[PDB]
Amino acid sequence: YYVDWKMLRDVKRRKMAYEYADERLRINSLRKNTILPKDLQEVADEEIASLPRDSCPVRIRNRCVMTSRPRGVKRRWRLSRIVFRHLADHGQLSGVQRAMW
Template identity: 85%
Template sequence: YGELFPWPSATCTNQVRNYYVDWRMFRDVKRRKMAYEYADERLRVNALRKNIILPKELREVADKEIAAFPVDSCPVRIRNRCVLTSRPRGVKRRWRLSRIVFRHLADNNQMSGIQRAMW
């Protein structure tokens, strides 16, 4: 038995099929990667678009360049989600947890340095 399973937890492990909680979180992660990848280029082209000193033709070219970028490269499409439940609303940004999960973990003393208000 020891040769087959050298560590005791090998018999009772669960298979982790996906790294992300659901497809919404996976989609958001893809958007974050895309926004990070195109951030520098997008910043420069937007600066050209919004510069009123430049000729109108040049700004129109910059408009077309921005339109040619992938839609998911826009940082506005990124949504903060809870890392445990993928809930999009009521997320405590500092801990990246939804208010429901945050309260549950705080009530059960599972968050270091966090406790319920007592007076």
């Protein structure tokens, strides 16, 4: 079990987005190019908008990995701010400490 249904959704999304990365890239090559004619690019356009909607990366969310919180995340530990503090304050995060200066 992932902690939340939402997290589940996200796992799927990352899987699909991993699978179609090659197709998406190859097509958006054509799409993003001035050199090729527009007639290729409109077909290529429908091509990439044909692809399953959950395969596109912008639909991914970086979520807290233990607690599933959608924001207030620190990218480095993939941790919610709350869970991060909870680990660091027991000193289970090496080299992390309160800051005085």
